[PDB]
Amino acid sequence: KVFGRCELAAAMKRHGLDNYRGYSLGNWVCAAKFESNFNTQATNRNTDGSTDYGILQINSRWWCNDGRTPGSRNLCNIPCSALLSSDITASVNCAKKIVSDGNGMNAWVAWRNRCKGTDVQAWIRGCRL
Ligand code: NA
């Protein structure tokens, strides 16, 4: 599924991502924009042979099992395919663990490079939340 900006903002809030670990909803929408372009089916191979899955490009290296990432962990206790669902619950649950891991949203390199310190409120501007 390709979400709209305000539709994704609404689904993130309903799943308790808004202000989770102090990160305003605009920060999560901005990360999703540049990770996946709001596409729940987005997958990208990393050079180390791990894969990033879903709206928030969660990495098989640590967080999900795709069965092809040697030496990896599955810390969110899920198949990486569940991160590709039109329902974002599993992606949200697992992003809660990632952002609690100690480096906050810096774990999303696109967040750091393209969202951090920007006017992230623009991402939820005009949205009926
Ligand atoms: Na893994």
Contacts of residue 67, Cβ cutoff 8 Å, sequence gap at least 6 = none
Is the Cβ–Cβ distance between 124 and 25 less than 8 Å?
Answer: yes
CA of 95 to the centre of ligand 1 (A): 15
Output the six-digit token pair for 68.
Answer: 């092809």
DSSP annotation string for the chain: -B--HHHHHHHHHHTT-TTBTTB-HHHHHHHHHHHHTTBTT-EEE-TTS-EEETTTTEETTTT-B-S-STT---TT-SBGGGGGSSS-HHHHHHHHHHHTSSSGGGGSHHHHHHTTTS-GGGGGTT---
Locate the domains of the chain by residue range: 1-129
Q: Which residues hold their Cβ within 5 A of ligand 1, which is an ion?
A: 60, 65, 69, 72, 74
87 C-alpha to center of ligand 1: Å? 21
Any known ligand binding at 18? no
Residue 42 near residue 36 (C-beta atoms within 8 A): yes
Nearest to 74 by CA among 63, 86, 88, 89: 63
Active site residue 52: yes
Resolution in A: 1.6
d(CA 46, CA 72): 13
**Given the residues 7, 18, 48, 52, the one annotated as active site:** 52
Active site residue 7: no
| Domain range 1-129, its CATH number among 3.40.718.10, 3.90.850.10, 1.10.10.10, 1.10.530.10 | 1.10.530.10
